[PDB]
Amino acid sequence: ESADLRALAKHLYDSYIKSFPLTKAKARAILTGKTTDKSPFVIYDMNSLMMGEDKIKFKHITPLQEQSKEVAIRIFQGCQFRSVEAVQEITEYAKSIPGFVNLDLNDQVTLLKYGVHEIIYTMLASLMNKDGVLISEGQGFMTREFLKSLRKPFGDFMEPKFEFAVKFNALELDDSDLAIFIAVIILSGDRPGLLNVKPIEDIQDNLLQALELQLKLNHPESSQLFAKLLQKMTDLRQIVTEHVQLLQVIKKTETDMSLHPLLQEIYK
Amino acid sequence: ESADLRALAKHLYDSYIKSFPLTKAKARAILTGKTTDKSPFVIYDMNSLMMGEDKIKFKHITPLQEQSKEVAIRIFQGCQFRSVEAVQEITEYAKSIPGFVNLDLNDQVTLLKYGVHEIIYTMLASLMNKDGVLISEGQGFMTREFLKSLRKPFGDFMEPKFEFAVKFNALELDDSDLAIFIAVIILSGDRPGLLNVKPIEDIQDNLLQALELQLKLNHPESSQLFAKLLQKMTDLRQIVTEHVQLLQVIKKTETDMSLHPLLQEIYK
Ligand SMILES: CC(C)c1ccccc1-c1ccc(O[C@H](Cc2ccccc2)C(=O)O)cc1
């Protein structure tokens, strides 16, 4: 019944708001510099980076970089910390997906393990525009250009994310839509090492119906949006890989830099 | 309109039947399926290959294993031959899809160029079962066991297609279904280098509606099958990506020789 699919759609949207302090709506309100009720400080060079520590809460360093964790590492660590924030956040959203917590404890861990970064980049697109990405809860805005100019390695960590987000955002999706799509991603079952696949696919079968109806209702004039969105799941998978291998490179060229256990545990 | 979507399906099916010798319906009668009226020649071991490869309808080389060319290599190059045949079959099919030829020729070459590998592994799965793959227009059956028993490079060449195949076949799709899915794969839109993505996506949109109608009417009880088929695309891409990987590795085994020139040329 439709009435049941809409109720689940309302449910998930609801938990989505409660689990993510920064929705796409808040994000676009800040990005479209019309809503000047609170604008972001912009980082596009080293000076701004320093000055950034001023206006925004940057526990990081302000002055010298190189001989004291150069700019590149500093941002990378900063980015590392947020990812941990997001996982914890995403993990809280997951518990609310009907049926998820009733699965084998092991699978729960496996679903999170593979689905988390795929989710981080999906939601990360909400904080991006062709020119940049929001940081520190919207208060800041770091330039894509400044990012694409960091030290040899770190210099190409976000580019594949921007490329994904610009075309993904062109789908004009909203929080209520993403809420369901985010859940569909978690309850895969095609995930490596699962014990009970049928119970997982039964949940996702629901999420997909929910999403199909939600997209029809929310975007009547958008033919086949449902399918276009599912295919986007390939671009996601590909991004994770580019990243994971990229991560492997730093680890070797930076034996002094560390990887937060929670993020380290996910990668494998 | 459903009428128009029922026409496009039958059209593609008709083209499909005439472009591909071995149909899934046929191949299935031969495989695990009984339908015994001419049992294929089973290659399960080295001698089986040797002792058949001399009676089987294979055109390229013969059983000569004794410091006279390696077996693994002869088998690998054999797939290349068949894949190159397959590529011509697909092209012949691509041309029957409404709108395809009306596209920028450069874009057609780009679409076939990148859609071909995914189409091959998809269709390969029709000739596969959990224990082996039909060979030579269906006159043979090379076991999965023998394939993983191969040397060192070549021992993991086909294993991932088997893992993909077994899950893919779990969907129980038939030639009428595969005919539309295949078309959808060719009419992507995200292939690198395209020049005019719009028409390509318009046709895919039209092809997607067809696959959706087809699956609903053809598999009424199989819920959300459409969504599940579309996510098999991630699996394909990974297969494809991971394949070019061994390809580069193999490129570090056999190479510099003067009797290969005009042969190496047929397969870039
Ligand atoms: C917005 C964030 C998720 C992000 C994504 C992709 C690339 C970089 C970042 C990023 C986020 C915050 C950054 O600066 C600090 C990071 C930080 C936050 C809290 C404690 C320690 C560091 C901040 O904005 O608060 C720098 C980069």
Coordinates of C-alpha atoms and ligand atoms in Angstrom, one line a residue:
Chain A
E1 CA 0.0 0.0 0.0
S2 CA 1.1 3.5 -0.8
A3 CA -0.1 4.8 2.6
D4 CA 2.4 2.4 4.2
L5 CA 5.3 3.5 1.9
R6 CA 4.6 7.2 2.7
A7 CA 4.6 6.5 6.4
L8 CA 8.1 4.9 6.1
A9 CA 9.2 7.9 4.0
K10 CA 8.0 10.3 6.7
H11 CA 9.7 8.1 9.3
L12 CA 13.1 8.1 7.6
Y13 CA 13.0 11.8 6.8
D14 CA 12.3 12.4 10.5
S15 CA 15.3 10.5 11.7
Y16 CA 17.4 12.0 9.0
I17 CA 16.7 15.5 10.6
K18 CA 17.5 14.3 14.0
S19 CA 20.7 12.6 13.0
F20 CA 22.4 15.2 10.8
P21 CA 23.0 18.8 12.1
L22 CA 23.5 20.1 8.6
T23 CA 20.9 19.2 6.0
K24 CA 21.1 20.0 2.3
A25 CA 18.5 22.8 2.7
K26 CA 20.5 24.6 5.4
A27 CA 23.5 23.9 3.2
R28 CA 22.0 25.5 0.0
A29 CA 20.7 28.4 2.0
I30 CA 24.2 29.2 3.0
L31 CA 25.8 28.5 -0.4
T32 CA 23.4 30.7 -2.3
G33 CA 24.8 33.9 -0.8
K34 CA 21.4 35.6 -1.0
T35 CA 20.4 34.4 2.5
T36 CA 22.8 36.6 4.3
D37 CA 21.5 35.9 7.8
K38 CA 24.9 34.3 8.5
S39 CA 27.6 34.0 5.7
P40 CA 30.7 31.7 5.6
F41 CA 34.3 32.9 5.9
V42 CA 36.1 31.8 2.8
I43 CA 39.4 29.9 2.5
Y44 CA 41.2 30.1 -0.9
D45 CA 44.8 30.6 0.2
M46 CA 47.3 30.3 3.1
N47 CA 46.5 33.8 4.4
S48 CA 42.7 32.9 4.6
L49 CA 43.6 29.6 6.2
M50 CA 45.3 31.4 9.0
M51 CA 42.7 34.1 9.2
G52 CA 40.2 31.2 9.2
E53 CA 41.4 30.0 12.6
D54 CA 40.3 33.4 13.8
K55 CA 36.6 33.7 12.7
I56 CA 35.9 30.0 12.8
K57 CA 36.8 27.4 15.5
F58 CA 39.9 25.9 14.1
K59 CA 41.7 24.0 16.9
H60 CA 44.4 23.6 14.1
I61 CA 47.4 25.7 13.7
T62 CA 47.2 29.2 12.2
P63 CA 50.9 30.4 11.6
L64 CA 53.6 28.1 10.2
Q65 CA 52.9 24.8 8.6
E66 CA 55.7 22.7 7.2
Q67 CA 58.0 22.2 10.3
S68 CA 54.9 21.8 12.4
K69 CA 52.4 19.7 10.4
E70 CA 52.2 21.6 7.1
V71 CA 48.9 22.9 5.8
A72 CA 48.3 19.8 3.7
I73 CA 48.4 17.4 6.7
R74 CA 46.4 19.9 8.9
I75 CA 43.5 19.9 6.5
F76 CA 43.8 16.2 5.9
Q77 CA 43.6 15.5 9.6
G78 CA 40.7 18.0 9.8
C79 CA 38.9 16.1 7.1
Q80 CA 39.7 12.9 8.9
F81 CA 38.0 14.1 12.0
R82 CA 34.8 15.1 10.2
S83 CA 34.6 11.7 8.6
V84 CA 34.6 10.2 12.0
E85 CA 31.8 12.7 13.0
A86 CA 29.8 11.6 10.0
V87 CA 30.3 7.9 10.6
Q88 CA 29.0 8.2 14.2
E89 CA 26.2 10.3 12.8
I90 CA 25.4 7.9 10.0
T91 CA 25.5 5.0 12.5
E92 CA 22.9 6.7 14.5
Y93 CA 20.6 7.1 11.4
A94 CA 21.1 3.4 10.7
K95 CA 19.8 2.2 14.0
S96 CA 16.5 3.9 13.0
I97 CA 16.1 2.0 9.7
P98 CA 13.3 -0.4 10.4
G99 CA 14.8 -3.9 10.7
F100 CA 18.4 -2.9 10.8
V101 CA 19.0 -3.5 14.5
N102 CA 17.2 -6.8 14.3
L103 CA 19.8 -8.3 12.0
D104 CA 22.7 -10.4 12.9
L105 CA 25.1 -8.2 14.9
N106 CA 27.8 -9.2 12.5
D107 CA 26.0 -8.1 9.4
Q108 CA 25.1 -4.8 11.1
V109 CA 28.8 -4.2 11.3
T110 CA 29.4 -5.3 7.7
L111 CA 26.6 -3.1 6.4
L112 CA 28.2 -0.1 8.1
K113 CA 31.7 -1.0 7.1
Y114 CA 31.0 -0.9 3.3
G115 CA 28.1 1.6 3.2
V116 CA 29.6 4.5 5.3
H117 CA 31.9 6.2 2.9
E118 CA 29.4 5.7 0.1
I119 CA 27.0 7.7 2.3
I120 CA 29.6 10.3 3.3
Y121 CA 30.2 11.3 -0.3
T122 CA 26.5 11.3 -1.1
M123 CA 25.8 13.7 1.7
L124 CA 29.1 15.5 1.1
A125 CA 27.6 16.6 -2.3
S126 CA 25.0 18.6 -0.4
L127 CA 27.8 20.9 1.0
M128 CA 29.4 21.4 -2.4
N129 CA 29.1 23.5 -5.5
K130 CA 31.4 23.6 -8.6
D131 CA 33.6 26.0 -6.7
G132 CA 33.9 24.6 -3.3
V133 CA 32.7 22.9 -0.1
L134 CA 31.4 24.0 3.3
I135 CA 33.3 23.1 6.5
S136 CA 32.9 23.4 10.2
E137 CA 29.1 23.1 10.2
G138 CA 28.6 25.7 7.4
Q139 CA 30.6 28.5 9.1
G140 CA 33.4 28.1 6.6
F141 CA 33.8 27.5 2.8
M142 CA 37.0 26.0 1.4
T143 CA 37.7 26.6 -2.2
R144 CA 38.0 23.7 -4.6
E145 CA 41.0 25.5 -6.2
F146 CA 42.9 25.9 -2.9
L147 CA 42.3 22.2 -2.3
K148 CA 43.5 21.1 -5.7
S149 CA 46.8 22.9 -5.0
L150 CA 48.0 21.1 -1.9
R151 CA 51.3 19.0 -1.7
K152 CA 51.8 16.3 -4.4
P153 CA 49.8 13.6 -2.6
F154 CA 47.0 15.5 -0.7
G155 CA 46.5 17.7 -3.8
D156 CA 44.1 15.3 -5.4
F157 CA 41.9 14.0 -2.6
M158 CA 38.7 16.1 -3.2
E159 CA 38.7 16.5 -6.9
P160 CA 36.9 13.2 -7.6
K161 CA 34.4 14.2 -5.0
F162 CA 33.6 17.6 -6.7
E163 CA 33.2 15.9 -10.0
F164 CA 30.7 13.5 -8.5
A165 CA 28.8 16.2 -6.6
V166 CA 28.3 18.6 -9.5
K167 CA 26.5 16.0 -11.6
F168 CA 24.9 14.3 -8.6
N169 CA 23.5 17.7 -7.5
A170 CA 22.1 18.2 -10.9
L171 CA 19.5 15.7 -10.0
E172 CA 17.9 18.4 -7.8
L173 CA 17.3 16.0 -4.8
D174 CA 16.1 17.1 -1.4
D175 CA 16.6 15.8 2.2
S176 CA 13.5 13.8 2.2
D177 CA 14.7 12.1 -1.0
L178 CA 18.2 11.5 0.2
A179 CA 16.9 10.2 3.5
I180 CA 15.4 7.2 1.7
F181 CA 18.3 6.8 -0.8
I182 CA 20.8 6.8 2.1
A183 CA 18.9 3.9 3.7
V184 CA 18.8 1.9 0.5
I185 CA 22.6 2.2 0.3
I186 CA 23.1 0.8 3.8
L187 CA 20.8 -2.2 3.3
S188 CA 22.7 -3.7 0.4
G189 CA 23.3 -7.4 0.8
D190 CA 25.7 -7.5 -2.1
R191 CA 28.2 -6.6 0.5
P192 CA 31.3 -8.9 1.0
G193 CA 31.0 -11.3 3.9
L194 CA 27.3 -11.2 4.9
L195 CA 25.8 -14.2 6.7
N196 CA 22.0 -13.7 6.1
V197 CA 21.3 -11.9 2.8
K198 CA 17.6 -12.6 2.5
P199 CA 16.6 -10.7 5.6
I200 CA 18.7 -7.7 4.4
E201 CA 17.2 -7.8 0.9
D202 CA 13.7 -7.9 2.3
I203 CA 14.3 -4.6 4.1
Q204 CA 15.9 -3.0 1.0
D205 CA 12.9 -4.2 -1.1
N206 CA 10.8 -1.9 1.1
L207 CA 13.2 1.0 1.0
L208 CA 13.3 0.8 -2.8
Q209 CA 9.5 0.8 -3.1
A210 CA 9.4 3.8 -0.6
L211 CA 12.0 5.6 -2.8
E212 CA 10.2 4.8 -6.0
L213 CA 7.0 6.3 -4.8
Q214 CA 8.7 9.2 -3.1
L215 CA 10.5 10.2 -6.3
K216 CA 7.3 9.9 -8.4
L217 CA 5.4 12.1 -5.9
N218 CA 8.2 14.6 -5.2
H219 CA 9.3 14.9 -8.9
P220 CA 6.4 14.2 -11.3
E221 CA 8.1 15.9 -14.2
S222 CA 11.4 14.0 -13.7
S223 CA 11.2 10.9 -15.9
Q224 CA 13.1 7.9 -14.8
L225 CA 14.8 9.8 -11.9
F226 CA 14.5 6.6 -9.8
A227 CA 16.8 4.7 -12.2
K228 CA 19.2 7.5 -12.7
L229 CA 19.7 7.7 -9.0
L230 CA 20.4 4.0 -8.6
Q231 CA 23.1 4.2 -11.3
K232 CA 24.7 6.9 -9.3
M233 CA 25.5 4.1 -6.9
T234 CA 28.2 3.0 -9.3
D235 CA 29.9 6.4 -9.3
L236 CA 29.9 6.1 -5.5
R237 CA 31.5 2.7 -5.4
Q238 CA 34.2 3.9 -7.8
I239 CA 35.0 6.9 -5.6
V240 CA 35.5 4.8 -2.5
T241 CA 38.1 2.8 -4.3
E242 CA 40.1 5.8 -5.7
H243 CA 40.1 7.1 -2.1
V244 CA 41.0 3.9 -0.4
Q245 CA 44.0 3.4 -2.6
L246 CA 44.9 7.1 -2.3
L247 CA 44.9 6.6 1.4
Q248 CA 47.3 3.6 1.1
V249 CA 49.8 6.0 -0.7
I250 CA 50.0 8.6 2.1
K251 CA 50.3 5.9 4.8
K252 CA 53.6 4.9 3.1
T253 CA 55.0 8.3 2.3
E254 CA 53.8 9.7 5.6
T255 CA 54.8 7.2 8.3
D256 CA 54.5 10.0 10.9
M257 CA 50.9 10.8 10.1
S258 CA 48.1 8.7 11.7
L259 CA 44.8 7.2 10.7
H260 CA 42.0 7.3 13.3
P261 CA 41.2 3.7 14.3
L262 CA 37.5 3.9 13.5
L263 CA 38.3 5.0 10.0
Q264 CA 41.2 2.5 9.8
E265 CA 38.9 -0.3 10.9
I266 CA 36.5 0.5 8.1
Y267 CA 39.2 0.4 5.4
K268 CA 40.1 -3.2 4.2
Chain B
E1 CA 2.5 4.7 -23.5
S2 CA 2.6 1.0 -22.7
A3 CA 1.8 0.2 -26.3
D4 CA 4.9 2.0 -27.5
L5 CA 7.0 0.4 -24.7
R6 CA 5.7 -3.1 -25.7
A7 CA 6.7 -2.4 -29.3
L8 CA 10.3 -1.3 -28.5
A9 CA 10.7 -4.4 -26.4
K10 CA 9.6 -6.8 -29.1
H11 CA 11.8 -4.9 -31.6
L12 CA 14.9 -5.3 -29.5
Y13 CA 14.1 -8.9 -28.7
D14 CA 13.7 -9.6 -32.5
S15 CA 17.1 -7.9 -33.1
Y16 CA 18.6 -9.7 -30.2
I17 CA 17.6 -13.1 -31.5
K18 CA 19.1 -12.5 -34.9
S19 CA 22.3 -10.9 -33.6
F20 CA 23.3 -13.6 -31.1
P21 CA 23.7 -17.3 -32.1
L22 CA 23.6 -18.7 -28.6
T23 CA 20.5 -17.4 -26.7
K24 CA 20.1 -17.9 -23.0
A25 CA 17.0 -20.0 -23.6
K26 CA 19.1 -22.3 -25.8
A27 CA 22.3 -22.2 -23.7
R28 CA 20.2 -23.2 -20.7
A29 CA 18.8 -26.3 -22.4
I30 CA 22.5 -27.4 -22.9
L31 CA 23.8 -26.4 -19.5
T32 CA 22.7 -27.8 -16.1
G33 CA 19.3 -28.1 -17.8
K34 CA 18.7 -31.7 -19.0
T35 CA 17.4 -31.2 -22.6
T36 CA 19.9 -33.9 -23.7
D37 CA 20.0 -34.4 -27.5
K38 CA 23.7 -33.6 -27.9
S39 CA 25.8 -33.4 -24.8
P40 CA 28.8 -30.9 -25.1
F41 CA 32.4 -32.0 -24.9
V42 CA 33.5 -31.4 -21.3
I43 CA 37.0 -30.0 -20.7
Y44 CA 37.8 -30.7 -17.0
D45 CA 41.6 -31.3 -17.1
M46 CA 44.8 -30.8 -19.1
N47 CA 44.3 -34.0 -21.1
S48 CA 40.6 -33.2 -21.6
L49 CA 41.7 -29.9 -23.2
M50 CA 44.5 -31.6 -25.2
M51 CA 42.4 -34.5 -26.1
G52 CA 39.6 -32.4 -27.5
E53 CA 41.1 -29.4 -28.4
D54 CA 41.8 -31.9 -31.3
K55 CA 38.3 -32.7 -32.3
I56 CA 36.5 -29.8 -30.9
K57 CA 35.4 -27.0 -33.3
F58 CA 38.2 -24.6 -32.2
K59 CA 40.1 -22.5 -34.8
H60 CA 43.4 -21.1 -33.7
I61 CA 45.7 -23.7 -32.2
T62 CA 45.8 -27.5 -31.3
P63 CA 46.9 -29.6 -28.3
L64 CA 50.6 -29.2 -28.2
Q65 CA 51.7 -29.1 -24.6
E66 CA 55.4 -30.0 -24.2
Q67 CA 57.8 -27.1 -24.3
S68 CA 55.6 -26.0 -27.2
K69 CA 53.5 -23.0 -26.0
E70 CA 51.8 -23.0 -22.6
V71 CA 48.2 -24.1 -22.1
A72 CA 47.1 -21.1 -20.0
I73 CA 48.2 -18.8 -22.7
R74 CA 46.4 -20.7 -25.5
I75 CA 43.2 -20.6 -23.4
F76 CA 43.5 -16.8 -22.6
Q77 CA 44.0 -15.9 -26.3
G78 CA 41.1 -18.1 -27.1
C79 CA 38.7 -15.9 -25.1
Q80 CA 40.2 -12.9 -26.9
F81 CA 39.2 -14.5 -30.2
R82 CA 35.7 -15.1 -29.0
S83 CA 35.4 -11.7 -27.4
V84 CA 36.4 -10.0 -30.7
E85 CA 33.6 -12.1 -32.3
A86 CA 31.2 -11.0 -29.6
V87 CA 32.2 -7.3 -30.2
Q88 CA 31.0 -7.6 -33.8
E89 CA 27.7 -9.2 -32.7
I90 CA 27.0 -6.4 -30.2
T91 CA 27.8 -3.6 -32.7
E92 CA 25.3 -5.2 -35.1
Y93 CA 22.8 -5.1 -32.3
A94 CA 23.6 -1.6 -31.1
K95 CA 22.7 -0.4 -34.6
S96 CA 19.1 -1.8 -34.3
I97 CA 18.3 0.2 -31.2
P98 CA 16.0 3.1 -32.2
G99 CA 18.0 6.3 -32.4
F100 CA 21.5 4.8 -32.0
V101 CA 22.7 5.4 -35.6
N102 CA 21.2 9.0 -35.6
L103 CA 23.8 9.9 -33.0
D104 CA 27.1 11.6 -33.6
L105 CA 29.3 8.8 -35.1
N106 CA 32.1 9.7 -32.7
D107 CA 29.7 9.2 -29.8
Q108 CA 28.6 5.8 -31.2
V109 CA 32.2 4.6 -31.3
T110 CA 32.6 6.0 -27.7
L111 CA 29.5 4.2 -26.5
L112 CA 30.4 0.8 -28.1
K113 CA 34.0 1.2 -27.0
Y114 CA 33.1 1.4 -23.3
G115 CA 29.9 -0.6 -23.3
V116 CA 31.3 -3.7 -24.9
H117 CA 33.1 -5.3 -21.8
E118 CA 30.1 -4.9 -19.6
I119 CA 27.9 -6.4 -22.3
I120 CA 30.3 -9.4 -22.7
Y121 CA 30.4 -10.3 -19.0
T122 CA 26.7 -9.9 -18.7
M123 CA 26.0 -12.3 -21.6
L124 CA 28.9 -14.5 -20.5
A125 CA 26.8 -15.3 -17.4
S126 CA 24.1 -16.8 -19.6
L127 CA 26.6 -19.5 -20.8
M128 CA 27.7 -20.0 -17.2
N129 CA 26.5 -22.1 -14.3
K130 CA 28.2 -22.6 -10.9
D131 CA 30.6 -25.3 -12.3
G132 CA 31.5 -24.2 -15.8
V133 CA 31.1 -22.1 -18.9
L134 CA 29.8 -23.3 -22.3
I135 CA 32.5 -22.9 -25.0
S136 CA 32.6 -22.9 -28.8
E137 CA 29.1 -21.9 -29.9
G138 CA 28.0 -24.4 -27.2
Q139 CA 30.0 -27.4 -28.5
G140 CA 32.0 -27.5 -25.3
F141 CA 31.9 -26.9 -21.5
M142 CA 35.1 -25.8 -19.8
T143 CA 34.8 -26.5 -16.1
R144 CA 35.3 -23.9 -13.4
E145 CA 37.7 -26.2 -11.6
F146 CA 40.1 -26.4 -14.5
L147 CA 40.0 -22.7 -15.0
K148 CA 41.2 -21.9 -11.5
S149 CA 43.8 -24.6 -11.9
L150 CA 45.8 -22.6 -14.4
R151 CA 49.2 -21.2 -13.8
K152 CA 49.5 -18.1 -11.9
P153 CA 48.2 -15.0 -13.7
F154 CA 45.5 -16.9 -15.4
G155 CA 44.1 -18.6 -12.3
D156 CA 42.1 -15.6 -11.3
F157 CA 41.1 -14.5 -14.7
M158 CA 37.6 -16.0 -14.8
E159 CA 36.9 -16.6 -11.1
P160 CA 35.3 -13.2 -10.5
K161 CA 33.0 -13.6 -13.6
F162 CA 31.7 -16.9 -12.0
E163 CA 31.0 -15.1 -8.7
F164 CA 29.2 -12.3 -10.7
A165 CA 27.4 -14.9 -12.9
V166 CA 26.0 -17.0 -10.1
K167 CA 24.4 -13.9 -8.4
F168 CA 23.3 -12.4 -11.7
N169 CA 21.6 -15.7 -12.8
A170 CA 19.9 -15.8 -9.4
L171 CA 17.6 -13.1 -11.0
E172 CA 16.3 -15.6 -13.6
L173 CA 16.1 -13.1 -16.5
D174 CA 15.4 -14.4 -20.1
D175 CA 16.4 -13.3 -23.6
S176 CA 13.5 -10.9 -23.8
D177 CA 14.6 -9.2 -20.6
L178 CA 18.3 -9.3 -21.4
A179 CA 17.6 -7.7 -24.8
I180 CA 16.4 -4.5 -23.2
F181 CA 18.9 -4.4 -20.3
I182 CA 21.7 -4.8 -22.8
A183 CA 20.4 -1.8 -24.8
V184 CA 20.3 0.3 -21.6
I185 CA 23.9 -0.5 -20.9
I186 CA 25.0 0.8 -24.4
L187 CA 22.9 4.0 -24.1
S188 CA 24.6 5.1 -21.0
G189 CA 25.5 8.8 -20.9
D190 CA 28.4 8.9 -18.4
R191 CA 31.0 7.5 -20.7
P192 CA 34.1 9.7 -20.9
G193 CA 34.5 11.8 -24.1
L194 CA 30.9 12.0 -25.2
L195 CA 30.1 15.1 -27.1
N196 CA 26.3 15.2 -27.1
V197 CA 25.0 13.4 -24.0
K198 CA 21.4 14.6 -24.3
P199 CA 20.0 12.4 -27.1
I200 CA 21.9 9.4 -25.6
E201 CA 20.1 9.9 -22.2
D202 CA 16.8 10.5 -23.9
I203 CA 16.9 7.1 -25.5
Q204 CA 18.1 5.5 -22.3
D205 CA 15.2 7.1 -20.6
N206 CA 12.9 5.5 -23.2
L207 CA 14.8 2.2 -22.9
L208 CA 14.5 2.3 -19.1
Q209 CA 10.7 2.7 -19.2
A210 CA 10.7 -0.4 -21.4
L211 CA 12.8 -2.5 -19.1
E212 CA 10.6 -1.5 -16.2
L213 CA 7.3 -2.4 -18.0
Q214 CA 8.9 -5.6 -19.4
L215 CA 10.0 -6.8 -15.9
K216 CA 6.7 -5.9 -14.3
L217 CA 4.6 -7.8 -16.8
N218 CA 7.1 -10.6 -17.2
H219 CA 7.9 -11.1 -13.5
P220 CA 4.8 -9.9 -11.7
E221 CA 5.7 -11.6 -8.4
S222 CA 9.4 -10.7 -8.6
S223 CA 9.2 -7.5 -6.6
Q224 CA 11.5 -4.5 -7.3
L225 CA 13.5 -6.6 -9.8
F226 CA 14.0 -3.5 -11.9
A227 CA 15.9 -1.8 -9.1
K228 CA 17.9 -5.0 -8.4
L229 CA 18.9 -5.4 -12.0
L230 CA 20.1 -1.8 -12.2
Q231 CA 22.3 -2.2 -9.2
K232 CA 24.0 -5.2 -10.8
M233 CA 25.7 -2.4 -12.9
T234 CA 28.0 -1.7 -10.0
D235 CA 29.1 -5.3 -10.0
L236 CA 29.7 -5.1 -13.8
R237 CA 31.8 -2.0 -13.6
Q238 CA 34.0 -3.6 -10.9
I239 CA 34.3 -6.7 -13.0
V240 CA 35.4 -4.5 -15.9
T241 CA 37.8 -2.4 -13.9
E242 CA 39.4 -5.4 -12.1
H243 CA 39.7 -7.0 -15.5
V244 CA 41.8 -4.3 -17.1
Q245 CA 44.0 -4.8 -14.0
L246 CA 45.0 -8.4 -14.8
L247 CA 45.2 -7.3 -18.4
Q248 CA 48.1 -4.9 -17.5
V249 CA 49.7 -7.7 -15.4
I250 CA 49.5 -10.2 -18.3
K251 CA 51.1 -7.5 -20.3
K252 CA 54.1 -8.3 -18.1
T253 CA 54.3 -12.0 -19.2
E254 CA 54.1 -12.4 -23.0
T255 CA 55.3 -9.5 -25.2
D256 CA 58.3 -8.9 -27.5
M257 CA 58.1 -11.4 -30.4
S258 CA 58.3 -10.8 -34.2
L259 CA 55.6 -13.4 -35.2
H260 CA 52.9 -11.6 -33.2
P261 CA 52.8 -8.2 -35.0
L262 CA 49.7 -8.7 -37.3
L263 CA 48.0 -10.9 -34.6
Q264 CA 48.6 -8.4 -31.8
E265 CA 47.1 -5.8 -34.1
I266 CA 43.7 -7.6 -34.3
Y267 CA 43.4 -7.3 -30.5
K268 CA 44.7 -3.6 -29.3
Ligands
LIG1 C1 33.7 19.7 5.7 C2 34.5 18.5 6.0 C3 33.7 17.3 6.1 C4 35.6 18.3 4.9 C5 35.3 17.5 3.8 C6 36.2 17.3 2.8 C7 37.4 17.9 2.9 C8 37.8 18.7 3.9 C9 36.9 18.9 5.0 C10 37.3 19.8 6.0 C11 36.5 20.0 7.1 C12 36.9 20.8 8.2 C13 38.1 21.5 8.1 O1 38.6 22.3 9.1 C14 38.2 22.0 10.4 C15 38.4 20.5 10.7 C16 38.3 20.2 12.2 C17 37.0 20.2 12.9 C18 37.0 19.9 14.2 C19 38.1 19.6 14.9 C20 39.4 19.5 14.2 C21 39.4 19.8 12.9 C22 36.7 22.5 10.6 O2 36.1 23.0 9.7 O3 36.2 22.3 11.8 C23 39.0 21.2 7.0 C24 38.5 20.4 6.0

